Subunit: 222 residues, 7 copies
């Protein structure tokens, strides 16, 4: 319906301008004589930029070796996190940790940070010990005992950092940090370490007679 | 009204400049003699870029096979999630899970991650068991019993990961994870598994005599 | 005032450079002799890009048929949601559900997902049943009764999905999902179905003697 | 101080390269002989793009008529909301509802959704009735009475939608919607309608003996 | 160290390709004979775009008069809010309301909304009266008394809007709006008006015997 | 491995097309005869744009003087906040208030707002006095006493604004503002003023017998 | 399947237009005779921009020295934070503090702020002392004692700032700041200082007999 409107308006204006009035002079204006092939050729290479970008980065990642097949990857700027299964010239395929596929233009990789935890040395452990303002006295001996517990712990890479320190206050909690690594990289082993650690911690706290700290409040009634 | 203003100002300036004063010299400045067809031709191919991009990516997805018809898709960077019903040269049509249609320029796909859970191997299960700080003693035996329960569970792909581990503390809760897959991909079967699982879990907890953990607080009165 | 500054500085520098000193040589530098028409012509087609984009997409949506007049539309990437009332070559007009007008450049549509619920097959129903941790025992029989209730329900498209399953825990609630469609698309009919459904649900729960679940907490006093 | 550094380094390198050593050959490299006028002319039309865009869209909105003077406008993608007071070729002026002025490049409008509630037909009313889980029994009769109240209400456009339906559960509340329009567009009249409506509603609820619902919780003590 | 690597690899490949093997043919490839001045000249005008944009918009704001010196400005899209102290060709200087300076490229202004409250007519007043669900009966007489109080108030521009209406429910509160302007623009006068207003309001409420509404909740114990 | 695939596919197609079939005609297509130096030269000046932008803005900030060495700077659009230590042609170096270094492309500055609190006149003070709804009566005398306290305060620039006014209600609090400047700019002096001020305020409140306001709530039990 | 559609439609239209009708005239339109090599050559240098950008910035960071190997880095605009292990011409490699690798295009660095805490002078300490409104009297003597404690503290760089001042009120807390540096940069030493500090603080508070402040509320019952 609307192209009828466009064509009818153009046909109306032209036929009226050339029947009511009629052109004494002659204009040489050809809608189709314009040889300017050049325009579409020009337009070819511009139009296809994502694909062109993909082949370049595919080549480079075929030479540059950020990651390899079967390596756990993550990105900190995009939700791109799994294991490589394949490369392509333009895009790769990842199995997510949902055992699901992920198809990805590689041109993305050119301007984005990239991480390979499957290349890493070790895994990390951190926690925060919510302790009560009541328990302020015993903090140093708790921490020190705690540091010793980790230092006598086998699964740790003692040559990596080991930090046990009351770093900050908080709302109704006195938060001691933890920062320890494992000389393993096996997820399950790391978690077993984490578990036994937390348990030994709790043993230590409750052995010192102090207690952890929920959120807390102070009320005035009426 | 305003084109009257523009045209009147131009006509005023010109007619005044050419009647009050009048040009002794002669300037050859033609508003219409400029042959530069070239400009509009140039402008053609630039103006139509989204459409041009759509045809290219349509061709490529006709060759490249990220997804196929009738496959559940999702994206992690856009709310694009349903089942394909059709392809076009430029855009496709998805039925959402609202049984609603979705029309989409394919040029988008060129620079965006893509997922095909309908191609996947399996489905996933995870949970977090909110346990009370009181219940710290029984955690290992609970977990181990729990691990055994899953390992004796039929619907699981035991060859896929099976992680039951106290991964973190929290506000008033001791959170044990769960990470288990199903050798099925049928949504309803997966959910039935999930249901029976949760029930067996609860049985296990309350059989151990411990209890789950709501949010909790500690109050000081006046 | 400030053009006085610009012109005065230029006039000062020039008149001083040509009166204190005066140019022995002769430079042929003409501020106006530059024939380069080419620049403004070039600038014409570039300057007007939004309008140019609008006409193209207007043509395509006149050929491509994402939506039609009088169809409820929504977008998931922009707050664009109403019923079409009109097309234009460049922009359309929507009545929002406020019975208000909305004027829109069509060039937008080229690079944006689009939805036509007024083309859909059916409408959807979902809910989440907040149940108490106390009520863990009766969950399966509740669900099953509930599934039967829907299956014996007339207004449902039983050939579409029907999922009743305890999908997740939560803070102080055991959340059973619901996922059911209606073979209607009439908003009001859909809502009447929804209403009667919720009522039958509540009847079922309270007939089983269990109860729903508010948010809950656990307090320790002093 | 720093241009002394730049010029001194260049002068040092050159004078040393041409006094310690001295050029046997002769290079014809002129810092100023480059006739390439072309560069600045090129740069003219590119540099001024926002202004160029403003004039185009000013013309089009002088032809295209999204809005008119004295019309309440809003945008859903930008905080642009008031009444037009003026047009310009490039920008317009809005009085906000703070009785404050707003000056705006019109080029913005080319690629942005636009709304004219001052062109609308009617105004809207919606609410959500927080009812208690206790009150589940009386919901249908409440709703139906409520629907009748609106239907017997004069200021309503009964030919527009009238939806009164229990659409969703919530945290400690059973939320019934409302969706009704007014055949007026006068803000104050609309509000008077809204007020009397809410009052009649409350009368209806408390006449049925049920009650509304605050947020609520369930506590376990120690 | 690394340029040694680059240069050494290039020198190694070349010297090996021209000593182990040696070129029978002769290639005329000159790293420096390329006359293409054109490239750097081209690059000049492109490189300096922000500065070029600043001069243009500086000229226009020297002609276009969005704001003037000493005028309070704000933007709704950027945290740009103070009083002008100066103009420049490219950038201006604002004193913030911290009595601090702010230096700003003017090119920004070309594509951004702009506001001049220092040009305004009047200032605004709004509030929301949190009333209890208990107090539903007295709402109309309260509002009406309240409307009268404002109407008999001197500092108001009664010819501007005056809206006192129960616009919405809320969590544990019945929220009546306020919308009134002052025929002044002096900040301090406006605030004195606001203060005395709020006081008269409170007098009115507590004179009617009703009361305001905090957040509230409803508890079920165990 | 994959370049073997690319090269092998090309070699396979070509050798098969030229051995199974063989070209009767002769095509003059040279992969290397293309003289188009022009492409890489073109590409030079485009590729290096960030660096080019940095030198320009470095020159301008060497002429334009937004900031100087040793001046506290901040930006409202980026977390760029410290003291200048150095300029470069392309980038500068800031010491943050962590006594840490910050290296920055200057091209950024071209299109970003900029602030120099180290150039300012004075520092600012503001607060909000949470008062209880009970205390509504005494507000004016409190404020007035408070205004007098500041007016008799030495360290204030009384010629700058001094606003003490009940500006808004809130959840369980009646919030009076404060807006006062110091004729100093020394951080520590400003803070000492702030401290003594707050103390005098508290003295004033508790001398009037009223009290501040925490968050508050209203409970209904069962 | 779909290329069959495209090719079949084109073949159908052409063969029908040239068999049903047949071209009396002769058009010289060659799909392959277009010599315009120029297009792909043009497209080469444009397509590869990320890589080109990487080499430039690699060179510059090889000359410009923001950071060096083994230096802790962070960015305030991206989650880019670890220790350098390597440089490349285009990208570098960071070990995160997870002992994980990070591969990064250097072109990013050109337009982004950068920080080198491993180059810093010192580390920082800050805290906020939540004190009760009850404790308003003792604030100055507490602060002053506290200032003295730090001033007599060895590990501090007393020549750097030392600020102890009641800077703000808050919800149920009177918040005194802390701002002190350490003449060390060793993480663990800094934390040991922090720990002993916090302890001395607590000693000071509880020695003054006042107490810290949790969140607090004020309740009205029914």
């Amino acid at each position: 319906x609307x192209x009828x409107x466009x064509x009818x308006x153009x046909x109306x204006x032209x036929x009226x301008x050339x029947x009511x009035x009629x052109x004494x002079x002659x204009x040489x204006x050809x809608x189709x004589x314009x040889x300017x092939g050049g325009i579409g050729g020009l337009a070819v290479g511009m139009a296809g930029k994502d694909i062109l970008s993909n082949f370049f980065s595919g080549i480079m990642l075929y030479f540059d070796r950020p990651f390899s097949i079967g390596d756990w990857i993550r990105s900190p700027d995009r939700n791109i996190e799994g294991t490589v299964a394949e490369i392509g010239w333009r895009i790769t395929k990842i199995t997510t940790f949902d055992n699901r596929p992920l198809y990805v233009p590689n041109s993305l990789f050119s301007s984005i940070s990239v991480e390979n935890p499957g290349r890493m040395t070790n895994r990390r452990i951190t926690t925060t010990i919510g302790l009560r303002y009541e328990d302020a006295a015993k903090v140093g001996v708790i921490v020190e005992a705690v540091r010793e517990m980790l230092k006598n712990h086998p699964a740790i890479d003692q040559r990596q950092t080991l930090l046990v320190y009351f770093n900050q206050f908080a709302d109704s909690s006195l938060n001691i940090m933890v920062y320890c690594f494992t000389k393993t990289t096996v997820w399950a082993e790391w978690l077993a370490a984490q578990q036994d650690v937390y348990l030994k911690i709790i043993d230590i706290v409750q052995s010192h007679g102090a207690d952890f700290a929920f959120p807390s409040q102070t009320l005035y009634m009426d």
